[PDB]
Ligand binder design. Structure first.
Ligand code: A1BTU
Ligand code: CL
Ligand code: CL
Ligand code: CL
Lengths: 410, 550
């Protein structure tokens, strides 16, 4: 068929991002993958009159998979896939009991890409020790990881899904980049059989989904409540920490009172001294505990602002996160605990946590947040692709300031 | 010229060709220009044009050694500023430690390289120039370029693509011959017998000549050692070109920068080079021609470098069949040095890491940072990460990374018991110490007066307040803790309201740019148990209120 013209935002030049150096093992995998893609027409080699570039990576199973980081090109094509060809986000997918994610990225590879736009998809396969300038390619078809690919394919996808939507009018289907999110209130077995029905329907229509032998239950998605320490007996230190955390919580929840607790510790006492609480003091504790049990007031999602995810390392394979748009206005908080395993590199847990947070943010708001990552920039840039199993890549930055508030977000 | 296919070139969108003025020149200049423009036109690299072309570009004439040659110069700045961007030519160069030994290596220099590659026809009209009349009475000689002009934005990258395509047929016929490409040169290696290799070199030359590229004969072909990019490439070893550290009485900022540069350059193969003290002098250099004094530490550091540089050192080329090993040693002063080797007495390369940015640091964190720098470099040079040999015990590192706030990647490493070792010099208590005096400390200062005070009150009734001059609200908060570290037993509980001071100590540094923090570190090592606790200031909670009286 004829191609949909793609125009960059006016006055915006193409992506000119640097290629990271890669292991020899990963370079060879990329050369192999790209040689096959060139044979199938999906990509072609290009000359020096193309100045643009987009990073490429190799990820894994036992088979090497290629991953293009289209973050920059997506920003420079936002109008094309967000305004002109935007895909609306359903607000009922979060309400579903079970949500399954299906990879439908292979559909794009049939559809040709606008000839005048191919130059902006240029990527470079790096050489070792700067021996070679690099193998340079550009896409001839809609590339995976570009946000205009699902936007262009949208009408074909809506058509292929319509017969299944008619039969199953209570099933929510939402497309974000290369994935379909399918949510139903059915029992797990019914939902699983429904997912296979959709997989077979898509296969009947020519959409291979590599799901041959991700289940998410979003009913539990909420802002977790702050939990004050419960103690049979209380020391000066214990009251001190309790008062401090309550004062920090007062920034979020107004109405916290600690004046009675402050009086309970009087004089230059000893930290290990055991101070029993006053009747008045317990009343303040009981009021603050109930005040924190309720959710915050007036915290709404602003779709004109960007979502922000903050993560803090807690130890013993436990991580906590907050998603917000303005300070102390958390839209979502959670605690990701690594599935207990031998392999436990903090990078692996951080990488797995970032993927979990990003998927929830897609299901809840239809967009990804920008992460504040508690890791050194170079360490993450070196090792993040080792455990990366997603097709998208969120924005991120690195925080060099230790929090000092880790206990507070417990 | 050549039969190579021309790369299509566009002007930057919304721009047009360069229409620049041609200022007159002397008669001997206009003469030597025509003596070259007629010989350039003869070889087809330029061509006379008519008035229809509306563009123009300045032409100048200059000579070397007042030699017979009077080279032409064209300033293509206006065109270059209006031409499309191209793929960026090679930025970094191969490192000698990443080369693999070939039984024979040859170097070939391409002559007239840019002028031997044709230029896109539709783009030639924007390259026009003029040789002026003797007195602006005669008409000018309009001309135009047919090949890649020297000093044009696209010339370097179009040549490299043309050369790479030209090499493709020979490379397919000769799959065992390695050909490095770099600017106007080709570095050809092989594992063939000298006579067999010399025949393949002559084969490459003839192939390159049919494509229009001239190349030196064996009479003019160089021989090892090759002096490439400040290196010395020998048939079985590599090292840097000789370093010259000048002797001077007055060292200007520029001179110090050059000295620090040569020393960094020498550090890739000479182990132990240090540039901390010399670089510290550079801090706030400002004027490059300013004369700066030398610290006794700086002269000592420079003296040790001269001692290191006195004897020569060389590195080895890379062998993919052997392991890649990295070993790190702490030099002191926040400086580390490392070697990368596969065999014991020969190193592929060396280097050093300094944490200049952080005021407060922990040896373990620095070691982790240095590992990261080596890992990135190993990937660039060899395409893989090394097996590390580090002066730290597993229980020491496992303790640090377990409790560190950031995520850390600890690769394969084995302990090397070669002091200075890396250890945890102290550790704060995770819970308060029963049977220990509890100091409630506080401090403050006035910003205008710069006069402050630091004091404490303890649960046993002890009280002190000390005056401080020329201090900060931050320094006094650290002074309060230092006062309580002193005047206390081997086990002490310290309660502060300063999140700043708590943050610095909780990071558990072992060195800093503050003498006060260095003194606090000394106390923390000398103590047995220290628990540092924090409370909100001005909350009037317990002891803190009484200390706040200070
Ligand atoms: N000026 C110049 C210049 C000269 C040679 C270069 C170079 O040579 C090779 C070229 C091809 C394969 C291996 C090479 O090098 C292996 C190691 N090696 C090096 C030298 C000798 S004499 N013998 C030997 O084994 C690679 C890169 C840049 C070069 C620049
Ligand atoms: Cl731009
Ligand atoms: Cl450094
Ligand atoms: Cl002491």
């Amino acid at each position: 068929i004829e191609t949909v013209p793609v125009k960059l935002k006016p006055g915006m030049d193409g992506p000119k991002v640097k290629q990271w150096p890669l292991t020899e093992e990963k370079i060879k995998a990329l050369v192999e993958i790209c040689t096959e893609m060139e044979k199938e027409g999906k990509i072609s080699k290009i000359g020096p009159e193309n100045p643009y570039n987009t990073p490429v990576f190799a990820i894994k199973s036992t088979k090497w998979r290629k991953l293009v980081d289209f973050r920059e090109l997506n920003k420079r094509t936002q109008d094309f896939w967000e305004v002109q060809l935007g895909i609306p986000h359903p607000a009922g997918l979060k309400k579903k009991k079970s949500v399954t994610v299906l990879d439908v990225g292979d559909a794009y590879f049939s559809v040709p890409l606008d000839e005048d736009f191919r130059k902006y998809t240029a990527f470079t396969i790096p050489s070792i020790n700067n021996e070679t300038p690099g193998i340079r390619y550009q896409y001839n078809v809609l590339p995976q990881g570009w946000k205009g690919s699902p936007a262009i394919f949208q009408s074909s996808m809506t058509k292929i899904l319509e017969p299944f939507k008619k039969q199953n009018p209570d099933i929510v289907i939402y497309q974000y980049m290369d994935d379909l999110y399918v949510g139903s209130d059915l029992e797990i077995g019914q939902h699983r059989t429904k997912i296979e029905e959709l997989r077979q329907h898509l296969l009947r229509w020519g959409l291979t989904t590599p799901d041959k032998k991700y289940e998410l239950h979003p009913d539990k998605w909420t802002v977790q409540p702050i939990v004050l320490p419960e103690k049979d007996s209380w020391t000066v230190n214990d009251i001190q920490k309790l008062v401090g955390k309550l004062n920090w919580a007062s920034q979020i929840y107004p109405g916290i009172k600690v004046r009675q607790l402050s009086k309970l510790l009087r004089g230059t006492k000893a930290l290990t001294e055991v101070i029993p609480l006053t009747e008045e003091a317990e009343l303040e504790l009981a009021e603050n505990r109930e005040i924190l049990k309720e959710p915050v007031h007036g915290v709404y999602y602003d779709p004109s602002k960007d979502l922000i995810a903050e993560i803090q390392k807690q130890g013993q394979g436990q991580w906590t996160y907050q998603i917000y748009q303005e300070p102390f206005k958390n839209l979502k908080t959670g605690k990701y605990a690594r599935m207990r395993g031998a392999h436990t590199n903090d990078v692996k847990q951080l990488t797995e946590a970032v993927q979990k947070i990003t998927t929830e943010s897609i299901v809840i708001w239809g967009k990804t947040p920008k992460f504040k990552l508690p890791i050194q920039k170079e360490t993450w840039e070196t090792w993040w692709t080792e455990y990366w199993q997603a097709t998208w890549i969120p924005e991120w930055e690195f925080v060099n300031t230790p929090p000092l508030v880790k206990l507070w977000y417990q | 010229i050549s039969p190579i296919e021309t790369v299509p070139v566009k002007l930057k969108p919304g721009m047009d060709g360069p229409k620049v003025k041609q200022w007159p020149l002397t008669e001997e200049k206009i003469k030597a220009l025509v003596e070259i423009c007629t010989e350039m036109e003869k070889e087809g690299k330029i061509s006379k044009i008519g008035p229809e072309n509306p563009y123009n570009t300045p032409v100048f004439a200059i000579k070397k050694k007042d030699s017979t040659k009077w080279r032409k110069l064209v300033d293509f700045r206006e065109l270059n500023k209006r031409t499309q961007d191209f793929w960026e030519v090679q930025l970094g160069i191969p490192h000698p430690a990443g080369l693999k030994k070939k039984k024979s290596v040859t170097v070939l220099d391409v002559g007239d390289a840019y002028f031997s590659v044709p230029l896109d026809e539709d783009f030639r009209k924007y390259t026009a120039f003029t040789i002026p009349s003797i007195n602006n009475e005669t008409p000018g000689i309009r001309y135009q370029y047919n090949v890649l002009p020297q000093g044009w934005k696209g010339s370097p990258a179009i040549f490299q693509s043309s050369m790479t395509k030209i090499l493709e047929p020979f490379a397919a016929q000769n799959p065992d011959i390695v050909i490095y490409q770099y600017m106007d040169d080709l570095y050809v290696g092989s594992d063939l017998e000298i006579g067999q290799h010399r025949t393949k070199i002559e084969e490459l030359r003839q192939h390159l000549l049919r494509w229009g590229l001239t190349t030196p004969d064996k009479k003019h072909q160089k021989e090892p050692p090759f002096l490439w990019m400040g290196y010395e490439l020998h048939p079985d070893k590599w090292t840097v070109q000789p370093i010259v550290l000048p002797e001077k009485d007055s060292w200007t900022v520029n001179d110090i920068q050059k000295l620090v540069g040569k020393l960094n350059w020498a550090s890739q193969i000479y182990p132990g080079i240090k540039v901390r003290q010399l670089s510290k002098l550079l801090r706030g250099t400002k004027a490059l021609t300013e004369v700066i004094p030398l610290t006794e530490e700086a002269e000592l550091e420079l003296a040790e470098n001269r001692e290191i540089l006195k004897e020569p050192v060389h590195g080895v080329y890379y062998d993919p069949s052997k392991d890649l090993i990295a070993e790190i040693q702490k030099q002191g002063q926040g400086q580390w040095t490392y070697q990368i080797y596969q065999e014991p007495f020969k190193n592929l390369k060396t280097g050093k890491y300094a944490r200049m940015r952080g005021a407060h640091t922990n040896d373990v964190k620095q070691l982790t940072e240095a590992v990261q720098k080596i890992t990135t470099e190993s990937i660039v040079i060899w395409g893989k990460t090394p097996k590390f040999k580090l002066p730290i015990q597993k229980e020491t590192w496992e303790t640090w990374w377990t409790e560190y706030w950031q995520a850390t990647w600890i690769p394969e490493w084995e302990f090397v018991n070669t002091p200075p070792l890396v250890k945890l010099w102290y550790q704060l208590e995770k819970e308060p110490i029963v049977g220990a005096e509890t100091f409630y400390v506080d401090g403050a200062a006035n910003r205008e007066t710069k006069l402050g005070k630091a004091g404490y009150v303890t649960n046993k009734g002890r009280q002190k307040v000390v005056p401080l001059t020329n201090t900060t609200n931050q320094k006094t908060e650290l002074q309060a803790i230092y006062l309580a570290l002193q005047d206390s037993g081997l086990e002490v509980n310290i309660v502060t309201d300063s999140q700043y001071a708590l943050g610095i100590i909780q990071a558990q540094p072992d060195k800093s740019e503050s003498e006060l923090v260095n003194q606090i570190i000394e106390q923390l090592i000398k103590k047995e148990k220290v628990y540092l606790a924090w409370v909100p200031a001005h909350k009037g909670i317990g002891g803190n209120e009484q200390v706040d009286k200070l």
